[PDB]
Paper text:
It has been observed that an enrichment of negative charges on the surface of a protein can contribute to solubility and acid stability, and perhaps the observed enrichment of negative surface charges contributed to TaHAL’s resistance to acid and heat stresses. Measuring the temperature-dependent conversion of histidine to trans-urocanic acid by TaHAL in buffer A showed an increase in enzymatic activity with a maximal kcat at 60 °C. Upon heating the cuvette to 90 °C, only small changes in the absorbance at 222 nm and the spectrum as a whole were observed, indicating that the TaHAL protein retained much of its secondary structure even at high temperatures. The pH profile of TaHAL activity showed an optimum pH between pH 8 and 10. We found that TaHAL activity was well maintained with exposure to pH 4, but the activity decreased when TaHAL was incubated at pH 3 and below. Exposure to pH 2.8 allowed for the recovery of ~20% activity following neutralization, but 97% of the TaHAL activity was lost following 2 hours at pH 2.5. Upon titration with phosphoric acid, the protein appeared to maintain nearnative secondary structure until a pH of ~3, consistent with the observed partially irreversible loss of activity seen at pH levels below 4.
HAL is a tetrameric enzyme that catalyzes the first step in histidine catabolism and thus is important for central metabolism; consequently, it exists in a wide variety of organisms from across the tree of life. We decided to use the enzyme histidine ammonia lyase (HAL), an enzyme from a family with broad synthetic and therapeutic applications, as a test case. Specifically, we demonstrate that the HAL enzyme originating from the archaeon Thermoplasma acidophilum is tolerant to both heat and acid stresses. Thermoplasma acidophilum histidine ammonia lyase was identified as an enzyme with a promising catalytic profile following acid treatment.
Numbering used by the authors:
A (entry chain A), B (entry chain A), C (entry chain A), D (entry chain A): 0 to 51, 63 to 140, 144 to 496
The structure:
């Protein structure tokens, strides 16, 4: 489909649509004409200010934009994946169209065409203290220097632009400044991350259904009036989701007739998962403002140019560290439920979910892998925004460090996705030891798993099944299986 | 004054009023009669359930409540300060009155009288994994065992109750369970913490006025349309506060005539401080639900008793870790502004703010102290809720660890308060090297400082002046000086 | 007894003897005469340098030392406990006597008399970035200003000195510089900490004996040739200690006849505890150099005065963070063994170690307390020395942050001591459910516990028994019971 | 060249030689015959034990080894780089030859041929809690299942073995157990890491020479008697290295005539860098024992098979976290020196090292990149070994988490290498603003830089020059330039 950019209407899910699903972007002629008219008012104002040799003056200003793009292109490390650079470019484009950046219509159209033709700059992941260097690398590619991916093939930027039918872009007065000042690296990455955090929670709900039924949990933990006696919006909503999906379970109807309560990895699912949902909503609210905001500097309002601090990443740096914590602890709870599934003394199922403990270990070791992933996430959950280091000869003497936070959030998301893939695998196997009177919803998840991953009889490498299920998650196959 | 408790109307500032300002609490006869009627419905229901020897049965149930209070009284370490135990008791009382805990009117009245007569249990700080043990210690004192403070003097609980004219309380059916299950230790401490976080931000605004004027900052960073181009509510509100307080400054009017922009510790005050305000608001919203919620277990709705997981601390454990991060980074920005004040090459003022660098160090070393405090806060900002350790033979196999988070937030608050006291001290001294054309608002802060702390001429121990200013902050003298 | 100081022979256990056991210090007349002769050579050299008005010159130099002591007295927060300030003073005194500090004999004798008469400066804990401010507070008291404890009573320093029969000390040329530059705050605190870490390991060995016998462990895990197949010195030594102490156990002889192996909290005791012993030895080696080193600045060698960087805390800042980690993980292993003791499915003993699970919880909750303490230690194990913040207008632009690390190590030590007290309590109770055929060594620990703490029948507050056992540990009663 | 393996002589630098420089490994016929004779004694012992149907018994034992390899092959995530898998394989091979693992000569020869023919298993990085899963993946490839790299091309393991002229290996009695139990993943990776940490320190010495001369430092900070007044071995050795390399500097001879002391990033180089050297030596000592130790389980001594805990990673898990901290703080000091170089008020050189601050930013932004890298390292320096999560239904209830620590140490090393590359770049540029009277040693570093990276006149992307210098470091070109 088509995402129209007007500088004020971008949603986080539209950033995803462009970056991950490759929807086209466009900008109306009306928007572009108003952008251009503001760009011209800005030129008139600076041309009057300087005269209170015109040719040497303009050529100097153009050289400045180039020197800035080049000197600031100082990232190191592996290139950021293309889905993230596309997200950053969509957010950057939208925020330059918000009306305060005084850039020209041509700069916006340049970014539109790079996105629609998939000329994606090569952006080293590291260098922003929260985003001059990564955005400079984007501009460097826009100028036809450095490297870029053309339809996923790395090459010199000038060759990628040429294969796409584009000309290198020449930055005008203050357009390099505009492009590289702001929070679009952090906010673009975090837009994708918050969408992937939502997808994590959705998958954790579905994978918990399998474990919850295999362990014969009671629905009493999701009683509406209990959940409403402590009405955080997340836990009320999560309780509703679980009640709906457990409807029709014979296993759970039996449990309700003979069980009072379960261990916390079942009974506390609404409190914990609903906290995670609340944090996701918090971050999405921050981003919803941020990706429609002017975060470059200085800014132009049509009659004056004023320097402020809107490039400072603090609100999104804090949000990235917060969501990292919440997701790490979601992963801890899923790992603990996996640890209960394979422990015959807690589950009431055969040890380690194998039919012959004699010469098989079953799924003993994926639980270690899940614990390993939690331990890695506990390192990564240290808040990068609790630190700051002065830059620019102490003139930029407090910084958010939110780029660190955005990048490590991406790894936590990757790791928690593997933990949940492990719960899909082991919860499906655990149900093989039940009478399978699971709800229709649980059975949709179970059947989708079994389309690609067989039940476990003799030992075989769990790694391959985990990777298959992780690929299914990344293709949204369980959300499709059970809306 | 008087705070009336009805189980549904408690605000965080009312918890503060009771705990810190010693306002009386009361519960209307109407509330108490409805609590008692629900308690009696619960007894009828459990008495009918058991009969589908009455005397031995009831005596057994009473012994159970006692065994629970005693066995769970397993905290270690120093006693929590009385203002916090009072906050916890007010939140506990309100949440047992929310209508689902089936306790008797007498238990609530017991807690009312302990608060109004200042019989405050001795509560070891450590033991909750997020709050059985600390709340058990409260109940232990309520039973007249263990220790308590009577009007601030430590003694055996039975002696404290007797000096207050109270009888030890005997817990009825499920009343010990009700008292010790829930989140009131975390939520009571965090209610006081979020009030103190607000007071921190208020003091940081006032102490920044001194530095901002001494460094001759330009008001251009607070231009309304710039701040509104990125309209996070915090930074818009903070900008308004600073514009109002800088009104009437000759220093700033001059700066605006000759300066374009300042370093980030001045120019980025709205982005960073407004992020902190937003986080404070987030936490207050969580607590506003939590302290009016039923977090004990099982719960009673008038016709059935159901076990759920509302005691699980996750939403407030996450909130405590989040606020710890935001406050640590506020402290980093204040420390960096202090570092600019004493550096003659950044400030344009005499080195280290002494009139004779020859044989004096001036205020060189308080900046080290501020850095030391930041480094301590960077340790404490590690999120305790990213971890979990299984308890109760793996039946309580995921826990929030939010008690850790509440307690370390209190230390961060203490440390940031000292950083701000240091900025009050050094910003006031720095203004001695200006023409003092500061705004009327800044001058109110400056004059309040000078009522108790003299300007620096010859070197003298900064420790004593820092402590004086910290005491003034704790008595709210700068908020009084400048509303 | 008597510790003689000569600037080159101090051991960490001598620092403990002075600071904690109140042994007297002395300095021979020979040492003092050589110190004085070097002080006089230094004066001659600086008096010749300045002359390539003598009265105004010397008076200026004296005023400088005073200004330095006062201006640098900039700590905040609670006063450090007297045992630590005594340790710091003993290390400071020894390191000024090492021969490079050019101080006078009178300064050393001043410190000797403060220690022997117990006039201990009041030292705010916070302010060093790794130790100007805390050592300045010591000097401030030495000058008779600020506050001090006289035989444990806080008062004005001049009054404490007067009650002790001492005169205030007047610092001579470069003597204030000498006193306040160096690492003695970090190294004094860490000398006590490493002694207390050793005492922790010794107590953990003894408390593990109780659990190991109650769980019927097999001695096969301590087989000498197994431990020697991986000959880290710690695990070989720990294995020898456990073999010796388990000699004579009927329980273990039975286990060896029917068991192949135990869970890791028993079988891996040598690997983990021996790693801890190795780290303790590492730190002691660092301190053994450091407390006999010249860490002030500039230094004097008898013919020239040269400025170097020996005050930089890096080797002891790293050591403090390392030992914090090792002790935190020792506490994790003890907590996991406690978690096994109270879980009937792992221990083979009654659930939660109570004789009547019907209406008692036994020792269910001390395991939560141990988990809580581990979670707190996981926050505190963040390495403060991984951070640095520039001080002194960027002239002191990398600092160790080792004071933070020393102080948080003290809390970890306190917390792990409580975890071990909990294992003493619960391992002794667990043996009540065995036939008591424990070794003579284990029985010495068991009997010492039972001298003050009764076995558990009906529920009672574990807090009080934990505190009693912690007090016994602090009085070294189990090391006395079993050498 | 040729590394001969005998189970007891392996050095960390030999692991590097095999893994990184592709030296061949061999095992003498004598070693192999004694390994085989012990394997046969083990078979005799277990065959006698079982008989106190032989065919079904042996076939069962073989199936067990296969089930174990497969079930434990449960890693997730990207494949570990081949240099690390080669290191792990060399350490595993040596430790199985140490004499206690009872494996056959054929298993050792299999590993020898995989290394010498470069058939390197594909090993997912994540899964060990400290190394069943990664070592299982190695064995899986050895069995001809899963994936492997043949001369760097990924393919099915059976195809890689076939292209190399090898047959799949069939694991004999207890040989799969032997292969997958132990610490070789952690210890192999850490052997390469400690070699790369040494190479980091060596490069940091050389890059500091450039900055030290450009800033005109005084050699007084390296005076031998000062450094020996605090004789930690590292700082004495580092001081000697710097004195030797600064010999012949006209710049430094001038500085010594007019300067007393420098800022800490120059004056404290011996204290900090020597601490790092000491930590490196500590880790190398641990590894020197560990890679020659029997860490599998159970172990065989020729007459009995006994289960112990030598697989527990604690000593190397702690060492990996320790070295991570020390290297992070080395990176902080290098970043602070970079921050001094580009600040004209600290350096005395043109702002940001550009000849025309008018329209150029010079090397302003690489300092941000260095700060960004430090902030990332501060996250990664959180100690993974402070945490533990129970595995295997609580039977493996304390684990080292040292695999996490080894992997994140590799990233810290990568990041610090970039920081040092930045100092090479900017220190060389800074010398362009001096009279170049640098020492012959410094000039060797400067000239080697200038062979590939030109001085900066007009702004250009620093990223490319940083990457070039990082590649030069990885090819050891500065150690070659200046031994």
């Amino acid at each position: 489909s088509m995402i129209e950019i007007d500088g004020r209407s971008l949603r986080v899910e539209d950033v995803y649509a462009v970056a991950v699903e490759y929807d086209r972007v466009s900008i109306s002629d009306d928007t572009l004409k108003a952008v251009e008219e503001k760009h011209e008012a800005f030129l008139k104002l600076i041309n009057s200010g300087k005269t209170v040799n015109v040719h040497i003056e303009r050529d100097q200003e153009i050289e400045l934009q180039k020197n800035l793009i080049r000197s600031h292109s100082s990232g190191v490390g592996d290139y950021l994946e293309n889905r993230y650079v596309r997200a950053i470019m969509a957010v950057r484009l939208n925020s330059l169209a918000a009306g305060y950046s005084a850039v020209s219509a041509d700069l916006l159209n340049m970014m539109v065409e790079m996105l629609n033709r998939d000329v994606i700059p090569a952006v080293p992941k590291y260098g922003s203290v929260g985003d001059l260097a990564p955005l400079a690398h984007i501009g460097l590619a826009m100028m036809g220097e450095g490297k870029a991916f053309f339809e996923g093939r790395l090459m010199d930027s000038a060759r990628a632009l040429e294969k796409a039918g584009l000309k290198p872009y020449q930055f005008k007065e203050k357009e390099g400044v505009a492009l590289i000042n702001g929070t679009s690296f952090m906010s673009g990455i975090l837009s994708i991350a918050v969408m992937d955090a939502h997808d994590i929670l959705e998958n954790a709900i579905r994978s918990a259904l399998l474990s919850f039924e295999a362990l014969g949990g009671t629905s009493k933990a999701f009683t509406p009036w209990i959940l409403g006696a402590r009405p955080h919006l997340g836990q009320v909503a999560i309780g509703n989701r679980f009640r709906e999906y457990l409807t029709g379970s014979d296993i759970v109807k039996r449990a309700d007739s003979v069980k009072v309560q379960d261990a916390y990895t079942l009974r506390c699912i609404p409190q914990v998962y609903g906290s995670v949902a609340d944090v996701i909503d918090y971050v999405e609210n921050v981003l919803s403002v941020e990706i429609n905001s002017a975060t470059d500097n200085p800014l132009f309002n049509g009659e004056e140019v004023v320097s402020g601090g809107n490039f400072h990443g603090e609100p999104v740096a804090l949000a990235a560290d917060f969501l990292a914590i919440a997701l790490t602890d979601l992963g801890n709870m899923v790992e603990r439920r996996i640890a209960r599934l394979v422990d015959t003394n807690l589950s009431g199922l055969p040890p380690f979910l194998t039919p012959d403990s004699g010469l098989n270990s079953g799924y003993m070791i994926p639980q270690y892998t899940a614990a390993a992933l939690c331990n890695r996430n506990k390192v990564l959950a240290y808040p990068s925004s609790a630190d700051t280091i002065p830059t620019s000869a102490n003139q930029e003497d407090h910084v958010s460090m939110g780029a660190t936070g955005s990048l490590k959030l991406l790894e936590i998301i990757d790791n928690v996705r593997y933990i949940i893939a492990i719960e899909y695998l082991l919860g499906s196997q655990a149900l093989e030891f039940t009478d399978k009177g699971m709800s229709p919803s649980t059975r949709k998840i179970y059947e989708k798993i079994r389309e690609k991953v067989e039940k476990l009889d003799h030992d075989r490498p769990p790694s391959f099944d985990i990777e298959t299920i992780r690929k299914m998650m990344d293709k949204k196959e369980f959300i499709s299986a059970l809306p």
